[PDB]
Design a protein around this nucleic acid. Structure first.
Ligand SMILES: [Mg+2]
Ligand SMILES: [Mg+2]
Ligand SMILES: [Mg+2]
Ligand SMILES: [Mg+2]
Ligand SMILES: [Mg+2]
Ligand SMILES: [Mg+2]
Ligand SMILES: [Mg+2]
Ligand SMILES: [Mg+2]
Ligand SMILES: [Mg+2]
Ligand SMILES: [Mg+2]
Ligand SMILES: [Mg+2]
Ligand SMILES: [Mg+2]
Ligand SMILES: [Mg+2]
Ligand SMILES: [Mg+2]
Ligand SMILES: [Mg+2]
Lengths: 99, 103, 55, 101, 132, 129
RNA sequence: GAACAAUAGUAAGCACAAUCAUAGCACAUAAAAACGUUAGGUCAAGGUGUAGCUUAUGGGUUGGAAAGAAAUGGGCUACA
């Protein structure tokens, strides 16, 4: 090692646009901190779930508008029909417990 | 009405709906009109800051970081260094109390 | 009212150039295809399923 | 309707973690620096501590997209093994085959 | 016994398409693939989104075309445009068929914000590879 | 077909390398026949090789709840073809790669590396500061 | 409900076998493995039949857990 080596390295450093003045290994993290995309910002993170409200509401609309057809919702519906026709329904809010 | 499949493709492409060939992945993104020396050299916004202080150590690491970053445009980097000016000058009391006079 | 109209292989000239009929990227509609083609793993009958309705 | 209340709170954790993200990055820039004073670091400490803890990165949990299963999730497809296997076996998943060697 | 995606032996009368007559372990041996896209290759991205897209396209095509869908839906993805290929039974008159063709192409191009192309091939009765 | 000639000195390429990735072999074989026959007509003078295949294998638990002695093993194979073109122009490049790219199959992906020939930059020519 | 110098059995279907995968063979391994059995496992992957909860068996915040007197299964590292 030499002073010629230190000055050569500083030359390369300030030239290439890398870290110029000697720093700790610890502080260097902050370098890498702005050198990247932060974790919570990445599209592979915040865009993880497709919007469920979108598909759900869209297809339900398209259904009542008579375009899409949901056999699951028809099963459900028909079964709550035969559940309430029996007399066991879903109580109007506030009524069930105390009465 | 359509005369051919090629007419289909042609119209989709004029409309900008069909993709552009031979594909460059940068098609449709101009990056604000910027060039590298607006990205790489951040000296412009390091003008106002104490020069020999450790604040230049911290801000040179911040600078060298925002230089290496493809993920952000000019604007947001500048908002970073500006928020840093605003916050560093926000507390005048801390900097002076710490044992180094800082501008 | 049930409509069955014969495939294009019936109206096709034997030497008519191919790129006319298939200019671009396509699903392979069996009707417009003059060439008989059998795919599918054979049954023990010995018959690969026909070019018609084959998934 | 998101398939669970689980997926509800975690979605709100994705929005939030995107929102205060800049704050996080810039505060933790000073907080993790050695050269700067310890005094700016105690104050930066109270600062990221002040942020709502629903906006921090690690409070976020990876779940299967459709079936919401918290664990056994394949990172690349965001899908639980039950659903993955289901989809790939019908051949609805491209390129995925049964391994023999 | 392995129950993944299989059709059990009946009294021997059960009509079966080539598709459901082959166990998962046959995929790429005999069976082809239902969906085709770049995403699962060695060096590539966003397989997940093409998968979500796939799933919803299954749901959509089976709910939009009541009772007439013959065999499982073939998804192609080429140069950003989706070619949706469906083998469909003859039930409804041509009017409603083109209505729903245009309807689907429009709504799918516009939701997925990319050009969609829909190919329907009609079949007289469900294709039977085995039994019957 | 509108054609126009700009006076500017069109870009040269020493080696235009095209990687074609796939799952299946057959498609890449056919596509190879296609690119070869397309690059012969335009007198582009090319070669083709097969870069060795890469196989990824990962494992899932076979049952919904608990048997850990039982595992399903799933596989993804990526096969390669590489087209190597030498001594081509910029326009010949844009056309050939347009024709090759528009027709690219659905299951296959394409990665192109172009090494382009530049003489020297201006501030370097023969000044010394 | 079979006997091959054959005595009532013929049968497509599905297993096993055959082919595929392990980059050529052959082998090995891998895979494959019907029908049924153990009301075997899981309503916490998800989905549902039946019953229940609906100012609560619902939805949120905040803090709190997972301590060893032992008993044992499996491992890792050893005793040189
Ligand atoms: Mg975590
Ligand atoms: Mg077993
Ligand atoms: Mg072999
Ligand atoms: Mg063997
Ligand atoms: Mg085995
Ligand atoms: Mg076998
Ligand atoms: Mg066996
Ligand atoms: Mg029990
Ligand atoms: Mg349940
Ligand atoms: Mg229920
Ligand atoms: Mg509660
Ligand atoms: Mg808690
Ligand atoms: Mg003991
Ligand atoms: Mg050992
Ligand atoms: Mg040992």
């Amino acid at each position: 090692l030499s002073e010629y080596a230190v000055r050569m390295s500083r030359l390369s450093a300030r030239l290439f646009g890398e870290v110029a003045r000697p720093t700790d290994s610890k502080s260097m993290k902050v370098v890498k901190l702005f050198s990247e995309q932060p974790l919570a910002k990445r599209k592979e993170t915040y865009d993880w779930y497709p919007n469920h409200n979108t598909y759900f509401a869209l297809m339900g609309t398209l259904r009542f508008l008579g375009l899409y057809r949901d056999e699951h919702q028809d099963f459900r519906d028909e079964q709550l029909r035969l559940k309430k026709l029996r007399g066991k329904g879903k109580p109007r809010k506030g009524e069930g417990k105390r009465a | 009405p359509f005369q051919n499949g090629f007419e289909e493709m042609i119209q989709w492409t004029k409309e900008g709906k069909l993709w552009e060939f031979p594909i460059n992945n940068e098609a449709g993104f101009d990056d604000d009109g910027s060039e590298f020396h607006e990205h790489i050299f951040l000296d412009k916004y390091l003008q106002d800051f104490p020069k020999q202080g450790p604040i230049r150590h911290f801000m040179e690491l911040v600078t060298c970081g925002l230089s290496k970053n493809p993920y952000l445009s000019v604007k947001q980097k500048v908002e970073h260094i500006e928020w840093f000016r605003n916050y560093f000058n926000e507390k005048r009391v801390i900097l002076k109390e710490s044992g180094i006079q800082l501008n | 009212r049930r409509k069955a109209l014969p495939p294009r292989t019936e109206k096709m000239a034997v030497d008519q150039d191919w790129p006319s009929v298939y200019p671009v990227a396509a699903p392979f509609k069996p009707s417009a295809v003059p060439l008989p083609v059998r795919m599918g793993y054979p049954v023990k009958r010995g018959v690969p399923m026909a070019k018609e309705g084959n998934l | 309707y998101y398939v669970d209340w689980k997926m509800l709170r975690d979605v709100k954790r994705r929005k939030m973690a995107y929102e205060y993200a800049d704050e996080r990055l810039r505060i933790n820039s000073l907080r993790k620096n050695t050269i700067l004073p310890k005094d700016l670091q105690e104050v930066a400490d109270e600062e990221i501590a002040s942020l709502p803890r629903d906006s921090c990165p690690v409070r976020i949990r990876n779940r299967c997209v459709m079936t919401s299963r918290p664990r056994g999730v394949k990172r690349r497809w965001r899908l639980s093994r039950i659903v993955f296997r289901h989809l790939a076996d019908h051949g609805q998943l491209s390129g995925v085959q049964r391994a023999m060697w | 016994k392995n129950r993944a995606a299989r059709v059990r032996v009946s009294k021997g009368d059960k009509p079966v398409t080539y598709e459901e007559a082959h166990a998962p372990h046959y995929i790429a041996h005999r069976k082809g693939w239902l969906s085709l896209h770049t995403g699962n290759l060695d060096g590539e991205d966003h397989a997940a989104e093409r998968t979500v897209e796939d799933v919803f396209l299954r749901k959509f095509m089976l709910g939009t075309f009541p009772g007439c869908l013959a065999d499982q839906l073939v998804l192609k993805r080429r140069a950003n445009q989706l070619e949706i290929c469906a083998l469909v039974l003859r039930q409804l008159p041509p009017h409603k068929f083109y209505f729903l063709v245009g309807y689907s192409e429009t709504l799918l191009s516009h939701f997925y914000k990319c050009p969609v192309h829909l190919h329907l091939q009609t079949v007289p009765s469900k294709v039977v590879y085995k039994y019957i | 077909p509108e054609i126009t000639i700009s006076d500017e000195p069109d870009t040269l390429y020493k080696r235009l390398s095209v990687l074609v990735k796939g799952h299946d072999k057959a498609v890449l074989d056919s596509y190879e026949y296609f690119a070869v026959l397309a690059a012969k007509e335009l007198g582009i003078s090319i070669k083709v090789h097969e870069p060795p295949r890469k196989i990824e294998r990962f494992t899932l638990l076979k049952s919904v709840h608990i048997f850990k002695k039982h595992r399903v093993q799933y596989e993804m194979r990526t096969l390669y073809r590489c087209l190597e073109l030498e001594h081509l122009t910029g326009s010949t490049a844009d056309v050939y790669l347009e024709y090759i790219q528009r027709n690219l199959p659905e299951g296959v992906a394409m990665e192109v590396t172009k090494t382009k020939l530049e003489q020297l930059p201006e501030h370097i020519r023969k000044p010394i500061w």
